[PDB]
Design a protein around this ligand. Structure first.
Ligand code: ZN
Length: 187
C-alpha cells in the first residue's frame, strides 16, 4: 500500500478559534449531588455549531460546550462537568465570555487540555487569564498530552500520529506562559 497519511492536527494551521477549528470536548451532567451522563459522544468536530439550525457568531470549543450546558437545561443545584481538548488555551471574547459563565457562578468544573497558544500580551491575555483562572483548568496538551489526547478521543487510543518539534516549542510556550498569565507574575 502507498504510504499516504493526512495530518490536520500537526503544525499545519487547524483552529484559529472560530472557522473550521479542530476541537474536541467531553461533558457530563451532574445531578442529585452525583455525576451522570445522558449522551454518547467523545470529543468534538473540527468546526463550529454542534447541530443544525441556529448559528450566527459560532462556538469555538469554549462556548461550544458552554452551549451544551443550557442544552441539558439543568435545574440549578446541578453541576457542569465539562472537559475540553483544543489546539489552543483561550480566546479573546470566546474565553472572556466562557470565563464569565464559569466565573459568574461556583458550580462548573472544567479541564481544558489545550495544545498551545502564542500571543504578545494585548488582545489575548484577557480571555487567557480570565477563562484559565475563572473558567476552567487549562492544561498544556502538547506533545505529551497530545499523544494522550488521542488515547482519550481515539478508537485506537493514540492513533499513529507523528508529533512535530514545534510541540516542544509551543508546549514550552503555552505552559510557561499559562504560569505567568494565571499567576500574573509580571517580571
Ligand atoms: Zn474563538
Amino acid at each position: 500500500d502507498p504510504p499516504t497519511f493526512t495530518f490536520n492536527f500537526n503544525n499545519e494551521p487547524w483552529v484559529r478559534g472560530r472557522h473550521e477549528t479542530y476541537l474536541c470536548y467531553e461533558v457530563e451532567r451532574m445531578h442529585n449531588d452525583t455525576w451522570v451522563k445522558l449522551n454518547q459522544r467523545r470529543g468534538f468536530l473540527a468546526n463550529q455549531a454542534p447541530h443544525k439550525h441556529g448559528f450566527l457568531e459560532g462556538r469555538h470549543a469554549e462556548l461550544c460546550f458552554l452551549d451544551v450546558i443550557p442544552f441539558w437545561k439543568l435545574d440549578l443545584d446541578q453541576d457542569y462537568r465539562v472537559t475540553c481538548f483544543t489546539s489552543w488555551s483561550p480566546c479573546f471574547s470566546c474565553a472572556q465570555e466562557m470565563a464569565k459563565f464559569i466565573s459568574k457562578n461556583k458550580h462548573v468544573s472544567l479541564c481544558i487540555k489545550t495544545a498551545r497558544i502564542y500571543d504578545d500580551q494585548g488582545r489575548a491575555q484577557e480571555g487567557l487569564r480570565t477563562l484559565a483562572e475563572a473558567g476552567a483548568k487549562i492544561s498544556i496538551m502538547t506533545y505529551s498530552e497530545f499523544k494522550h489526547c488521542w488515547d482519550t478521543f481515539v478508537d485506537h487510543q493514540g492513533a499513529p500520529f507523528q508529533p512535530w518539534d514545534g510541540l516542544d516549542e509551543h508546549s514550552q510556550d503555552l505552559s510557561g506562559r499559562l504560569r505567568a498569565i494565571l499567576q500574573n507574575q509580571e517580571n
